Amino acid sequence: CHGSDSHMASEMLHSKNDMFNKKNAINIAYDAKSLAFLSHPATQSVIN
Amino acid sequence: INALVASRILERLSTHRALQGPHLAEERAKMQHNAKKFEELAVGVLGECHGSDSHMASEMLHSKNDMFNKKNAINIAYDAKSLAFLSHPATQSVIN
Amino acid sequence: YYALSKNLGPKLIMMMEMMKDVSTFVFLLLIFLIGYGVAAQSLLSPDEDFSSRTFIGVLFRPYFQIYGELFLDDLNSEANCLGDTPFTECSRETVRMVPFFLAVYILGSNVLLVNLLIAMFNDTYMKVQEAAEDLWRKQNYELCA
Amino acid sequence: YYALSKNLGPKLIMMMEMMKDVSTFVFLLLIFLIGYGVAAQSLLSPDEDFSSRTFIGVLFRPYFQIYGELFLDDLNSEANCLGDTPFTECSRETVRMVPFFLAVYILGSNVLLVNLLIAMFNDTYMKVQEAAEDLWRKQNYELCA
Amino acid sequence: AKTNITALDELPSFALAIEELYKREAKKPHSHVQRLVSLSNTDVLGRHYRGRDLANTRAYNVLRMDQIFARLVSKDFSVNRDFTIYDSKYDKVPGIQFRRTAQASHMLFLWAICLDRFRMARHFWLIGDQSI
Amino acid sequence: ADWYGHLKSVTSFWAVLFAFFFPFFVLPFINFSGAHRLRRKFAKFYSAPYTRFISDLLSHFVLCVVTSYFVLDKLEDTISAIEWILLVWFVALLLEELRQMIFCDGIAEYISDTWNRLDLIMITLFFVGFFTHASDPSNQDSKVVSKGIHAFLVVVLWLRFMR
Amino acid sequence: EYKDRPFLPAPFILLAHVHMLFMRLLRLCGVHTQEHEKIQDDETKRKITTFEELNTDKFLRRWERERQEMLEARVKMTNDNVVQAMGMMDQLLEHMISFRFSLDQQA
Amino acid sequence: TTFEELNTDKFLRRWERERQEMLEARVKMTNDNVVQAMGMMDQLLEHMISFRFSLDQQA
Ligand SMILES: CC(C)CCC[C@@H](C)[C@H]1CC[C@H]2[C@@H]3CC=C4C[C@@H](O)CC[C@]4(C)[C@H]3CC[C@]12C
Ligand SMILES: CC(C)CCC[C@@H](C)[C@H]1CC[C@H]2[C@@H]3CC=C4C[C@@H](O)CC[C@]4(C)[C@H]3CC[C@]12C
């Protein structure tokens, strides 16, 4: 995603999903304790 | 000189406003790859020269070429920001 | 003119790289220096009006105590302790906490921060030595030109 | 508020990791400090009743001598040695062992323990630098939230 | 069999099919599913409150399993199910077949994660959406 | 697991130390692996090797504190009570070292260990200092020389604590 | 070291010393006591034996499979297979030359 | 949704091609190919022995 369109990838990470009580992928990733996902440059770019 | 110029044009072209887009990604990648290859060529030929005749290689690096406003290969290399070419022992020997 | 030398020149480039670690050390020490300095100056003179001398007292001795010059004789004179043991038989008991604060402070500054600066330098040096050598080789032509 | 910075924040996490090495250094020095301090205080004053001043004398000068402030003039005054050479022509010959004990002590504390702390920091730093960077990246979201 | 609970009676046919897959795998000797459900200490609808006959005949329903997986993720994870879209009145809505597929796929996906069957899990993960 | 003598809650320094000093107030309310059981658990807890280490540490720590006060405080004109207590303590230590030499491994095996050599040096230093004081207790010079030998004794005692 | 050590701490170890001397005197001269211990049952012994034997076989199977998945072993095994393939071609050529003879004698 | 699905398929294709270009996979695949080559030789030998029988019965 980050290779193809950085802005569209940013838009996907910010999307709120109804199936997990209306919160985004980074919140799920933090709840899943996925250190590898959080340390990725794309995820860090959206957090910044 | 042509390999250095080619490396600079492909490297600068791959990071440009004309090449941004979702569909243009893979070619861009290709450009970077190609850039590296040309850089390798530019180093490689030079290395061969230093193996064969150090003095004649020194004479070739000092030659002024008319097609790029009468200046040598090291000036072109500096203008192309080729760190690999400048750090080579043959190039350093001519600078010293 | 040291930059033209193959020994002094890359080392100069490495020094410019290590300046960020120097800045990191300065930001961490500044915290301990102003905290300990305000606390120690207030503890030594609790009944004095604020002046410019109060501000120098907050930065003068705290900064120079991290280089090993401990002004313990001067601190002993300022604390008005008349005993042979250094901080006994004082007028106020609060000023006897002055060596304890100091005891914490030089543990923070000399044993902890200086040694971490040594660790940061060694790591930074190993990381950017080859890049510094390459950058010196580009600057060799630049100086020749 | 330094934790939000990409330079100061991971270094803060590394400092919290190096605190165990700091604790190791404190446990090893405590041994030499109380041993040398009780021995040196007893050697300087062998005919004095125990008091609170005896306890401060055991911890005051031993702790501050590891930072380079050597109270040799003060030790010379307390030993009652009247010679021009520092520990000659004393009333008791046992007090002439006071600089020798000191000679061993600062060899143990400054040359051995401080340099081992430097070695432990460098090893610890190289081990936990990448984990500290990853943990800072998780804390970046935590601070944003 | 019919149940007095309105939440359980609202469940579609495929939920009962997933319940049959959980029951059939669970009745096998030394199955980790039976231990997970018994050690979970919850009631039939999955709420952490710890008759008995319903609580045992339909002990591997989908709502309780959803609750068990929710506790496994974190302390405030709560997966939202919407089984009202499987009624025949919503068939005219554009793209409904994808949504019905996606939800169904998700439930089967979770079942395949529980039995540690990676290939079928990967297959249901690729069929559905919200991959990451 | 052999350490801790096979028990669940005995894991940190503080837990075993708290249970040691307070036997009747932390042991029943802890995980266990009548006079039939309390006595059995007490025999298992105090038969554990970790508990003997904790007892030896505490014993050596009191020895260090008591000997440190003895060398800092001035000597009296006769042999004091604390001096007699330290005399009994170091004979007991000397008898334990002799018992280990004769009845356990061998003399060669004992001398090989560096801590046994340190044990021998500390007992030797104390007895030289004690007899120096006890030869002439009212002599000021004897008091000064005795404290001089006992300075070395305190240095070895605190250095041995590292074991 | 701390398993065999005397139970009581240093100032009080003298009591432990006199207790050990009393036990040694009562055991050597008096002979009024002995030593008691506990012996594991045969059921738990054969249970430990079965576990150890099963895991020994399991480790040998895993070790053999791991050594067969190395790159060097695979290159060596493929090489031997190519050698066996030529051997089969040599047999094929013998059958071929036999027909050549048979077809020559058939005319 | 379309972007995420397309990139998921793209990553799986790239991942599969990368796993097929490893040295271990290539050595394993060439080894299986040599095994299949012997199998084809075994079939060839069966056809050969069939002619041997046919030529023997032809005289
Ligand atoms: C703050 C944390 C790190 C530890 C706490 C230790 C502090 C509270 C202790 C350590 C040393 C102490 C001081 C030591 C001795 C004296 C002399 C006494 O006549 C008055 C109190 C005074 C002046 C104490 C005040 C409290 C003190 C400063
Ligand atoms: C291994 C290291 C950390 C040893 C620790 C040394 C500490 C416990 C020692 C070193 C210097 C000491 C201080 C020296 C002088 C004084 C003044 C006196 O009037 C009260 C006690 C006080 C304030 C001491 C408190 C304890 C002290 C801070």
Ligand SMILES: CC(C)CCC[C@@H](C)[C@H]1CC[C@H]2[C@@H]3CC=C4C[C@@H](O)CC[C@]4(C)[C@H]3CC[C@]12C
């Ligand atoms: C203990 C190990 C490490 C080495 C032993 C060295 C010790 C025993 C030595 C080294 C220096 C020595 C001292 C040096 C000089 C004098 C002056 C003399 O008029 C009386 C003895 C006295 C005070 C010595 C006592 C013994 C001494 C302390």
Ligand SMILES: CC(C)CCC[C@@H](C)[C@H]1CC[C@H]2[C@@H]3CC=C4C[C@@H](O)CC[C@]4(C)[C@H]3CC[C@]12C
């Ligand atoms: C490389 C290093 C270890 C060199 C060793 C230095 C040693 C041998 C030196 C340094 C300082 C010295 C001491 C300095 C002063 C005195 C007081 C005097 O009345 C007796 C000797 C005595 C006690 C000295 C003994 C020897 C001594 C401890």
Ligand SMILES: CC(C)CCC[C@@H](C)[C@H]1CC[C@H]2[C@@H]3CC=C4C[C@@H](O)CC[C@]4(C)[C@H]3CC[C@]12C
């Ligand atoms: C092995 C190590 C630890 C032990 C060192 C030996 C010590 C206990 C002995 C060896 C030499 C001794 C010194 C020899 C001579 C004198 C001079 C006398 O007027 C006072 C005592 C004094 C200063 C002695 C003090 C104790 C002494 C230092």
